[PDB]
Write a protein that binds this ligand. Sequence first.
Ligand code: CLA
Ligand code: CLA
Ligand code: CLA
Ligand SMILES: CC1=C(/C=C/C(C)=C/C=C/C(C)=C/C=C/C=C(C)/C=C/C=C(C)/C=C/C2=C(C)CCCC2(C)C)C(C)(C)CCC1
Ligand SMILES: CC1=C(/C=C/C(C)=C/C=C/C(C)=C/C=C/C=C(C)/C=C/C=C(C)/C=C/C2=C(C)CCCC2(C)C)C(C)(C)CCC1
Ligand SMILES: CC1=C(C/C=C(\C)CCC[C@H](C)CCC[C@H](C)CCCC(C)C)C(=O)c2ccccc2C1=O
Ligand code: SF4
Lengths: 742, 31, 466, 147
Amino acid sequence: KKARVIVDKDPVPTSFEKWAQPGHFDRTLARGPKTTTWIWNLHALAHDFDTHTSDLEDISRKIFAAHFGHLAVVTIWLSGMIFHGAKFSNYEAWLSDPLNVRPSAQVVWPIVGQDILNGDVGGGFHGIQITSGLFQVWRGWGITNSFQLYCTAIGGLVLAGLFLFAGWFHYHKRAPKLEWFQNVESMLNHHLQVLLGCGSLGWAGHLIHVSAPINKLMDAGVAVKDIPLPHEFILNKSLLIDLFPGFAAGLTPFFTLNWGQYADFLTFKGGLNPVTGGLWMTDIAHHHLAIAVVFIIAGHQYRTNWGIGHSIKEILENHKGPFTGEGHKGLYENLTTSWHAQLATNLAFLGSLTIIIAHHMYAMPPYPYLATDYATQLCIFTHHIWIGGFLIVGGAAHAAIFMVRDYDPVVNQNNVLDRVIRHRDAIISHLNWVCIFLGFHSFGLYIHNDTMRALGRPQDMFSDTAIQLQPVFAQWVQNLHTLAPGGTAPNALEPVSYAFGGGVLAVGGKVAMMPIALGTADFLIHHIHAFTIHVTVLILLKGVLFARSSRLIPDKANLGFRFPCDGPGRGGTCQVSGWDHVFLGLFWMYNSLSIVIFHFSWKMQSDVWGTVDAAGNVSHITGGNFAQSAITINGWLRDFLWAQASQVINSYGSALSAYGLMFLGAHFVWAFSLMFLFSGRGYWQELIESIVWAHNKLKVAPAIQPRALSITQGRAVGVAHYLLGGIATTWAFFHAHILSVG
Amino acid sequence: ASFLSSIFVPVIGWVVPIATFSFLFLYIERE
Amino acid sequence: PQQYGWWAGNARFINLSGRLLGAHIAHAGLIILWAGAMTLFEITKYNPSLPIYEQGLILLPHLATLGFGIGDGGQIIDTYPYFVIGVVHLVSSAVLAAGGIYHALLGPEVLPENNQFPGFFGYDWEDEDKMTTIIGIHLLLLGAGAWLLVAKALFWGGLYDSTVASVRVITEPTVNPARIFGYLFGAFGKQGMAAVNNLEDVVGGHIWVGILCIGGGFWHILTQPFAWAKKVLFWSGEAYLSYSLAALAYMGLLAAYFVTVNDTVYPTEFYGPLGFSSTSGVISVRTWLATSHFALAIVFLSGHIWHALRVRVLEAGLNFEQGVVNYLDTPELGNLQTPINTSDLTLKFLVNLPIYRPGLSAFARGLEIGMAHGYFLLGPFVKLGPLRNTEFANQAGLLATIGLLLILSICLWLYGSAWFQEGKSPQGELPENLKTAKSWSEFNAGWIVGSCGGALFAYLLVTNSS
Amino acid sequence: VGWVTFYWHWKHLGIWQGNVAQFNENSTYLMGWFRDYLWANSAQLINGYNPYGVNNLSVWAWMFLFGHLVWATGFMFLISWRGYWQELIETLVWAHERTPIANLVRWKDKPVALSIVQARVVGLAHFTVGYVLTYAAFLIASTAGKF
Ligand code: CLA
Ligand code: CLA
Ligand code: CLA
Ligand SMILES: CC1=C(/C=C/C(C)=C/C=C/C(C)=C/C=C/C=C(C)/C=C/C=C(C)/C=C/C2=C(C)CCCC2(C)C)C(C)(C)CCC1
Ligand SMILES: CC1=C(/C=C/C(C)=C/C=C/C(C)=C/C=C/C=C(C)/C=C/C=C(C)/C=C/C2=C(C)CCCC2(C)C)C(C)(C)CCC1
Ligand SMILES: CC1=C(C/C=C(\C)CCC[C@H](C)CCC[C@H](C)CCCC(C)C)C(=O)c2ccccc2C1=O
Ligand code: SF4
């Protein structure tokens, strides 16, 4: 049927009544607290909308309104970052001197001696040095003064206001019906063509008209005050012609397919701008133009109201083959009747995308004066890897929640989903094996090496100077990408990244990017990554495939998604639920990504980053110790953790002291987590009994009876403090180190 | 006498474990 | 026929002989057109100043190596031989084009089978004799073609030689079998058949190939296929196509390796420097030929697999609707039927392993298993041990191997001792003759003797690599 | 006993080096312990072996890492509980039975995940063994290194 706007008017009357009725949304919670378990359950169930109401339409409306809420808080945050840039930063000083001045946009108040944290960051400014790369973003945007940031910040607060109103309006006042929400073809069309396509075209516009000219003048060493305001490039064409002659041709070459007339401001240079060590704005312009066209074309695929276009259901139903029975039949119903099926997908692939972004942004630094800002480089890579890893585990969680709650046998009979359930023992047994194989033939090589080195047998080690394990395939791919410009990418001048090959590119004294040579230490660490990813997948996939049932618990779907166990019987059934697989996958996600960011940190500091002599000799931050040290655990303990922790532990009485405190604080929160993970509810409830006795004895026993946390909450609190403590430790470590050496 | 190390350490390392694990395996599986 | 859609439209005349014939002559014509027309295309833009390898001319190098209008130092002096060759193909294309369109739709849909001379050309996919005779008939013309190259190399001028950079006439061809077939056994170099470094071995090779093809030519036309061939191969029309695709894929990779490493049969003055080389930004002819025919070999291997797997599915009596994944006739059993665990190849192979093979005594099973495992277990101990880079590398490795095999012999004795406890037979998929305590002792005795022997044999071969 | 032995050792290290000041001024904040005791006195221990060669503390350097490994292994048994493992072992039992040559051999005792109590025993053992060997290595290497 036809995609159309159809809403109910005034579905939910706006009133503070329910604000004064905590747990109104759940029938069980509505009765009120009897024990302290109620207080936890309130927060635990708050956003679990499927348990509020059965009605999919009411759930869809709650989700749509909540999203306007989350867009509002993210816009408040982004507006705040830009406002702090406008008011409490050395952005204007940093523009004048990017190489010397250190980016800072957080000033601490003088109280209890914490003003020490306002260090000398350059540009006659005292504040906390920021590692979020906002200054490099704003320079890329072509922002050259505090007033432009103020305008952008205020604009953001108005957009955050609009997003709040939208969320209130689209819930309380004009709530779309389920019909509206289930127009997946129209949504994909509008999100591909407008959100991504027109967003990318719009941005190409800004790049071509504002960013490229302003950045070109700044790279030509023109003073920030002397550079014309971005509107002067539109109003005064002559200024723009002088930088990019192609604008002389006007818009006729676009309409007459004489596109070579724009070859000066729409380039395919490759490599990096040698002044800034970032990607060329003219390459970025052409990228966003090319992206925009491909998206606007792509988003005319799905049939809406005019017959032309694909129906996704028919595409899915037609993709079946002799191994997969009914193939992708019934998956359209899964993805259009379950929000959890969509959230699973979108978290899995947005998480995977965020990790791709992490890799692509370090190797091809897109912003001016990012590549040489080693603190920003390390921090944005690590940040986006972490966000990626959490989102992926979220994908798996909501995949398991779908399997328990929203999976229908009738819809999903002899389809790809049904058939994976029927060989899940074959999937998990094989994945179990490949995990053990990778574990032995990746980690076991480190243990072999540690032992050989310890026994004074370096000739018997797995190393470049001993038994070599050269990553020949990755080495071969690096070569192909290095030979690409002029060859298999004829109209490229440089490679996409200097990481693949070409020359050392240097900005100031420092290496922006150079070839990242792969050897035995790179082969070993890559097979550690493969191992730690395959084990995380084993846990999460086992979680999703065995969420509904197993050979142990046939009726696991009836027990639900999040239950602690089915009792000490059958030998003991602790942590069989899909929730408990997510819990265990988080530790393995944490273990996996920890080694990824450690790999990145050490490899970049030893083999890429460093100073460049006038002659052209590169002196690396840790002097290429990775090749010989990163092949033993002792080498990681000594030359990475021990060596590079010197800055964080020696930070007291300086501007980095905060990272020293965060480092210990995080070690504490991590250790605190072991209380929750190693212990059980039974002990704590019995201890609370005695404490409750003493409160009873003095007539201070609370009406809301104290209870030990639930078995599940114990685990949830455990893994929360473990991840917080562990990640925060590395965060403090990375900052204190890279803000000293980088 | 130092040569005894070349006899005893391999015996305690291999012969004794094999003999002990072989017997204990045959004992725990005896019906 | 009618079940196939337009996309798979050429599959409609698998069982129709006339259309299938008409298609083959038509595609022959297309290859001839290209060969002829692109020869003229390359002649039209030959600059005699610049080298051939960095112009992007592919066929003129192939005509150049045969020694068609070249002086001294591999210099193209006359281009009339390239023109006469170009036009000969280009006209032959038009004759084969005519033959193609006739047999396509104007001719009969099925070639008739009868005792008359037109009846001979008619064939059926089931009658194995007629295809075997066709194999031999076209083999005589492969032999003929190889002898025509020899005649060109010996009598009609000769072939270009990169040693002296001149078109020398060949007089003394290498008719030594030990030398020519040595290339197949990797005797004269690591590169094998692509390690030829003189025209004397090239002409000698094409003599041997010539007589083998003609010899096989007479064999196949005068002999029907024996009972062992009747069982091991598939006999549908698509089975023959899948075999031919496997050959084409092998030949494509062979030539792709040849052009990459070999410089004698592909002179550097015509094709360019060895490996993958680009002069002044321009990619060399060698790189184009090497990388294209490598990619086409990977594609034609994908073609073999596709057409071979389709034959194997159809001959098993399975359709592509119900698929290739079934249940064990008792659905509530654990395993599923898959082409990995239930395929006739898998079952025949597993059944015929010494552990399961009928008519082997308990000892003979152990002995064969021992010999196999004992043999391969030497490698790791010899080549990666602590004494690997000493004179005692092989001896150390052998003592290690014997060591491991003795612990594995104890493991067997323990396993047997645990299970064989007065009557109660061991669980697991055993053969009927390993379900007694004495049979298991014989099996362990077999393993020991076999494994020690297998190790000793590998050691004798490793230490006598000379 | 960690707090007791750390205290005993760091106070004595100061007394033995004739540098009681170090303990006296730095022991009042936990960064002092972290830096001046753990970090500072790990220096020689972790160089027991390195790319440049080995010394007599190589065995303590290796035992130090062994302790760290055995401790960490204990966390597995203490954090991940039985139901996860019993469901995993069920698939391994399936795979063995269905593997064509391996299914020749059969277990006498049915493979099962360790009991709830056994896991706490095994977990606590790995944790303890890890704790003792890690500190024994550090205590001996750091003192014997200086003296
Ligand atoms: C250092 C700490 C540690 C170690 C060593 C392990 C080890 C393992 N975990 Mg565990 N895990 C841990 C912490 C650890 N975990 C923690 C803290 C948690 C709580 C979140 C978990 C939760 C968990 C889950 C949820 C899962 C695992 C799984 C695994 C196994 C993965 C397969 C593999 O790599 O086998 C290879 C073995 C190793 C890498 C261990 C070291 C091997 C040495 C170097 C070789 C042997 C030397 C020698 C022969 C020793 C014997 C000789 C001697 C007797 C004389 C592996 C046995 C997974 C699994 O079982 O799938 C297969 C799985 O799904 N773990
Ligand atoms: C506890 C005592 C112990 C002792 C005494 C040994 C002794 C040895 N081991 Mg070590 N090893 C041990 C425990 C022990 N192992 C444990 C627990 C592990 C697991 C962590 C290992 C893991 C290990 C590896 C991975 C390797 C060794 C190797 C060696 C040999 C190295 C010497 C050499 O270079 O000459 C060369 C010596 C030989 C080539 C072998 C000599 C003859 C053998 C020992 C027996 C011959 C048959 C015997 C008469 C009867 C059957 C065997 C048995 C039932 C006695 C040496 C024999 C290396 C080796 O050479 O393996 C074979 C080797 O690669 N060991
Ligand atoms: C876990 C991975 C791992 C690997 C790959 C190695 C590898 C090695 N070790 Mg080290 N080692 C390790 C962990 C590892 N180690 C650990 C955890 C320790 C304890 C700290 C040691 C302690 C140690 C010592 C003390 C010594 C070694 C030595 C060695 C070398 C010789 C060992 C040997 O001869 O075994 C022989 C191996 C086999 C017989 C098994 C081979 C497995 C085959 C190839 C699998 C084939 C499967 C096949 C492909 C699939 C089916 C085929 C199909 C056709 C059916 C070798 C390079 C020795 C050396 O001298 O160093 C150079 C040595 O003295 N290791
Ligand atoms: C940063 C920020 C901000 C801002 C932003 C902005 C300012 C934006 C804008 C945007 C824009 C400003 C965009 C636009 C765009 C546009 C477009 C997208 C267009 C398109 C067009 C087209 C598509 C065309 C078509 C056509 C026609 C019409 C005719 C002819 C043909 C053609 C086809 C050419 C704020 C404040 C919010 C806050 C936060 C941050
Ligand atoms: C690829 C493939 C395959 C294959 C592979 C393999 C398996 C390999 C290996 C191989 C091997 C594994 C081989 C072996 C061999 C062995 C031998 C060759 C032996 C020998 C022995 C001997 C001869 C001995 C002798 C003796 C004795 C017994 C006793 C006394 C002394 C003496 C010395 C006399 C299969 C079929 C699976 C499947 C399909 C695919
Ligand atoms: C320590 C621990 C407890 C005990 C912890 C409990 C009961 C949490 C209680 C802590 C909160 C912070 C109490 C908050 C009480 C009041 C709300 C505070 C009011 C005063 C403020 C306004 C300042 C468990 O219940 C438990 C359960 C299952 C597995 C492991 C464990 C576990 O390790
Ligand atoms: S120990 Fe806890 S999780 Fe395990 S069975 Fe008992 S109550 Fe359930």
